[PDB]
CSV table of N, CA and C and ligand atoms in Angstrom, one decimal:
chain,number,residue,atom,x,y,z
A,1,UNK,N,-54.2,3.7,50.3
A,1,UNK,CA,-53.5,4.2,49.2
A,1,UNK,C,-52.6,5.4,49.6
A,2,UNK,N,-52.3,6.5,48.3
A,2,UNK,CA,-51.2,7.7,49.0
A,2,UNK,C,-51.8,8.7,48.5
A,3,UNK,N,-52.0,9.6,49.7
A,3,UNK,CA,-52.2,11.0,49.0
A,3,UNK,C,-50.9,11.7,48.8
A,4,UNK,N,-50.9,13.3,48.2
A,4,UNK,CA,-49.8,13.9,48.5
A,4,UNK,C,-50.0,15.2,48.6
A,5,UNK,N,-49.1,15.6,49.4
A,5,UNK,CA,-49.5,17.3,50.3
A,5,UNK,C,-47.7,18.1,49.8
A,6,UNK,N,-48.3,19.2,49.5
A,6,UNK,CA,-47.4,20.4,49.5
A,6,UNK,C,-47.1,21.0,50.6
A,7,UNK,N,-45.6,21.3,50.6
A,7,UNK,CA,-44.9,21.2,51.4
A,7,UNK,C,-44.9,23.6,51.5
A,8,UNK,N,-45.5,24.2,52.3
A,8,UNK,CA,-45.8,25.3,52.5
A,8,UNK,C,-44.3,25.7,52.6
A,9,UNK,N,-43.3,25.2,52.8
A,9,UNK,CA,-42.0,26.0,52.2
A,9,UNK,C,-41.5,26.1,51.5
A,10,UNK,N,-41.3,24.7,50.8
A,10,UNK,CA,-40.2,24.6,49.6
A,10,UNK,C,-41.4,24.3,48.1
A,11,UNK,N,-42.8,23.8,48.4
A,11,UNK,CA,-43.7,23.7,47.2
A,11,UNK,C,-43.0,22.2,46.4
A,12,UNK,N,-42.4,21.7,47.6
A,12,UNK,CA,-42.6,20.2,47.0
A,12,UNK,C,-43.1,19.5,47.3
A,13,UNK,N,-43.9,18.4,46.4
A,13,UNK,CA,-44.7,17.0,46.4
A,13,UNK,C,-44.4,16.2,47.1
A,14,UNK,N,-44.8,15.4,48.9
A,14,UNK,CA,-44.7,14.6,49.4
A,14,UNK,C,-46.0,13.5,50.0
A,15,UNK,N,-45.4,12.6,49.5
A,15,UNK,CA,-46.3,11.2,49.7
A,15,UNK,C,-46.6,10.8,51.3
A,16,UNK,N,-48.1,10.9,51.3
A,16,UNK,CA,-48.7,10.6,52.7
A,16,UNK,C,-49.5,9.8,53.0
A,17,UNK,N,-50.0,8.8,53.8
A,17,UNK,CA,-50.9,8.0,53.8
A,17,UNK,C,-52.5,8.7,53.4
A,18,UNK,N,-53.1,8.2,52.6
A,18,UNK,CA,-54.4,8.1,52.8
A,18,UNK,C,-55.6,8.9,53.4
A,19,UNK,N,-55.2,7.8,54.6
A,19,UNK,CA,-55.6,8.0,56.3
A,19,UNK,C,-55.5,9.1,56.6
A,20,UNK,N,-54.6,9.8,56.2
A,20,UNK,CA,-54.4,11.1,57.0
A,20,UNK,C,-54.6,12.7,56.3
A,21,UNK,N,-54.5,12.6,54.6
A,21,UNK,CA,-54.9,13.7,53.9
A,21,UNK,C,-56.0,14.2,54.1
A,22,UNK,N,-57.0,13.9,54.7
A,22,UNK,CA,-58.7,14.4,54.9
A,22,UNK,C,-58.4,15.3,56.0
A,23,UNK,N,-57.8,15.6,57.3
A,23,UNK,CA,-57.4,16.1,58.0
A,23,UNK,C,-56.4,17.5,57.8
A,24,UNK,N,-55.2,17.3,56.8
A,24,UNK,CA,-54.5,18.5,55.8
A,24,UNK,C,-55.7,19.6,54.8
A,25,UNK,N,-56.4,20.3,55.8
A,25,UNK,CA,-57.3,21.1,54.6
A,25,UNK,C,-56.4,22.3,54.2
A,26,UNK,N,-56.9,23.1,53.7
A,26,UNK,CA,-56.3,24.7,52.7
A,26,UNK,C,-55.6,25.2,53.2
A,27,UNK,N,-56.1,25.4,54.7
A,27,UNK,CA,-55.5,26.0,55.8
A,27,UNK,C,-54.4,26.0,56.5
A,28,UNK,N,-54.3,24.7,56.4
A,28,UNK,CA,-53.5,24.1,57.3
A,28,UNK,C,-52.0,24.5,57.2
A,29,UNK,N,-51.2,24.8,57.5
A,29,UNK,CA,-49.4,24.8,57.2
A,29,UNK,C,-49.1,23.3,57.3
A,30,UNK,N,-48.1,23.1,56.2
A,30,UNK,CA,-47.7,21.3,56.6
A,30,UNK,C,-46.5,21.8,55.8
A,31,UNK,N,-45.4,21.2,56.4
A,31,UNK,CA,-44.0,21.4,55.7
A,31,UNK,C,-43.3,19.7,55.7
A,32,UNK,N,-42.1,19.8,54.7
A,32,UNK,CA,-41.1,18.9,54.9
A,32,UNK,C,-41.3,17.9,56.2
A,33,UNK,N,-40.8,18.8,57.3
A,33,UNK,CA,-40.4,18.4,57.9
A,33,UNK,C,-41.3,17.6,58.9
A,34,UNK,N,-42.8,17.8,58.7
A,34,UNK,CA,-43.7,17.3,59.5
A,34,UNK,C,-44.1,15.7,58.8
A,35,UNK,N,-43.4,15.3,57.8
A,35,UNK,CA,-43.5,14.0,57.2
A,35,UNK,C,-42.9,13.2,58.1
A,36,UNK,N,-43.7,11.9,57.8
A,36,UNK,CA,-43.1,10.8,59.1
A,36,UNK,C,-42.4,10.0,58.4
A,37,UNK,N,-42.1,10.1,56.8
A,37,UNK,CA,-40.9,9.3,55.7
A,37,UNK,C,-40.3,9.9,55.9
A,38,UNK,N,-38.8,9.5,56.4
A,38,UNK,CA,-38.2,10.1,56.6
A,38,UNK,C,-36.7,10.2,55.2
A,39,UNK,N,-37.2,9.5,54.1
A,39,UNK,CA,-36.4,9.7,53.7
A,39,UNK,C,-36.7,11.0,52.4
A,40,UNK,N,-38.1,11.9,53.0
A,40,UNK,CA,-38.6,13.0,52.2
A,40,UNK,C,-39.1,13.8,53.2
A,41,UNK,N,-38.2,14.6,54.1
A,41,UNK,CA,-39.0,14.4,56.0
A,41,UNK,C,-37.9,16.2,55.4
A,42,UNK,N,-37.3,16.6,55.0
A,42,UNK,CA,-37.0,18.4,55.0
A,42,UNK,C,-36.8,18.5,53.7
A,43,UNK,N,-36.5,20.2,53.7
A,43,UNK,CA,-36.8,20.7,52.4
A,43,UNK,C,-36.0,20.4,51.4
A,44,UNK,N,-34.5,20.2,51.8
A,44,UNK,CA,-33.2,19.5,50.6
A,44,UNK,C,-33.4,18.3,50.0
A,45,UNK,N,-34.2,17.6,50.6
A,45,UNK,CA,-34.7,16.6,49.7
A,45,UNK,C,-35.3,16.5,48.4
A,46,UNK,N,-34.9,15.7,46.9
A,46,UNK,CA,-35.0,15.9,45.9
A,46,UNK,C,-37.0,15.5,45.8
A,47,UNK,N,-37.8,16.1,45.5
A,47,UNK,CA,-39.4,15.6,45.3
A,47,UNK,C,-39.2,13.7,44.6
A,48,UNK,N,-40.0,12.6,45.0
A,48,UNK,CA,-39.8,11.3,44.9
A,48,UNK,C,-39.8,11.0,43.5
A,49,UNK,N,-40.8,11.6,43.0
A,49,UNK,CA,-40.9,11.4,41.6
A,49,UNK,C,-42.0,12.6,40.8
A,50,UNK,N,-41.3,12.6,40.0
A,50,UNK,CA,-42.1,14.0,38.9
A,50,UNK,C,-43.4,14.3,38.8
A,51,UNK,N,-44.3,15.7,38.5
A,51,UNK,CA,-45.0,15.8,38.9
A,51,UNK,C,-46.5,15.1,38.1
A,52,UNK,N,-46.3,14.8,37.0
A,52,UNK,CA,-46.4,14.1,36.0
A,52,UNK,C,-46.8,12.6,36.1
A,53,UNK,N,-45.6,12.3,37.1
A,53,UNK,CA,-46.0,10.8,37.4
A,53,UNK,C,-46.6,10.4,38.3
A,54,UNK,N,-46.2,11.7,39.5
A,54,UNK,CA,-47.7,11.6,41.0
A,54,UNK,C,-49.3,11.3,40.1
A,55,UNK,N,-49.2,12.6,39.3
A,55,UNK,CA,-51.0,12.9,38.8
A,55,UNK,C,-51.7,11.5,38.1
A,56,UNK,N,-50.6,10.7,37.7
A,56,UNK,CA,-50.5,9.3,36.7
A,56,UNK,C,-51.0,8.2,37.4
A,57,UNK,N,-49.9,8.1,39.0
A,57,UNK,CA,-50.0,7.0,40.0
A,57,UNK,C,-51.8,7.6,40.5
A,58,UNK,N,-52.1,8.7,40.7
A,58,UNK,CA,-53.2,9.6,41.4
A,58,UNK,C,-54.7,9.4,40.3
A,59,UNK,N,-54.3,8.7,38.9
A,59,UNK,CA,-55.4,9.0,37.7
A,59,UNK,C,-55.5,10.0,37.7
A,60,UNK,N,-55.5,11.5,37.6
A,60,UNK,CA,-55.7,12.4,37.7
A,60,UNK,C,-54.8,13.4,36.9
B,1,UNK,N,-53.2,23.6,53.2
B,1,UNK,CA,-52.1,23.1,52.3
B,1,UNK,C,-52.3,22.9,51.1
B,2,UNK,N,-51.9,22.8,50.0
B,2,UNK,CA,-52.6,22.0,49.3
B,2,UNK,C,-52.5,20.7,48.6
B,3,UNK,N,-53.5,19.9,48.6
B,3,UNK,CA,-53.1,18.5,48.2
B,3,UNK,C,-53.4,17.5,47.4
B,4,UNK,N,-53.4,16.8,47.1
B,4,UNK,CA,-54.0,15.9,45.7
B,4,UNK,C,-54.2,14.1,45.9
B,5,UNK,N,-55.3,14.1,45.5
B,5,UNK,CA,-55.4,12.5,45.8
B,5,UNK,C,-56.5,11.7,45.0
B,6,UNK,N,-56.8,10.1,44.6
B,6,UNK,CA,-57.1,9.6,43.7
B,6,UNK,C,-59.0,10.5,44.1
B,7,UNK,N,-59.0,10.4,42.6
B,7,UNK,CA,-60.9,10.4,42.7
B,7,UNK,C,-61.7,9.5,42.5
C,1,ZN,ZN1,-40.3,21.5,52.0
């Protein structure tokens, strides 16, 4: 499925595998630019979809 | 970071 992780510069919502959110703890720094989508990969990019409809696709 | 994902 997708997790999604905050982006520690700009505080926008980007979609990440699964697989890989368990590893992103509190601590961690993760930005834009460390996404491997590249079509949400830096910070000028518009967030995919509202925050509203992440929590929706997430049940949550 | 912080992040969010299905429960
Ligand atoms: Zn960013």
């Amino acid at each position: 499925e997708s997790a999604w992780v905050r982006c520690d510069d700009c505080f926008k919502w980007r979609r990440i595998p699964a697989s890989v959110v368990g590893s992103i703890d509190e601590s961690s720094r993760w930005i834009c630019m460390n996404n491997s989508d590249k079509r949400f990969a830096d910070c000028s990019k518009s967030q995919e979809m509202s925050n509203e409809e992440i929590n929706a696709e997430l049940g949550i | 970071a912080r992040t969010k994902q299905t429960a």
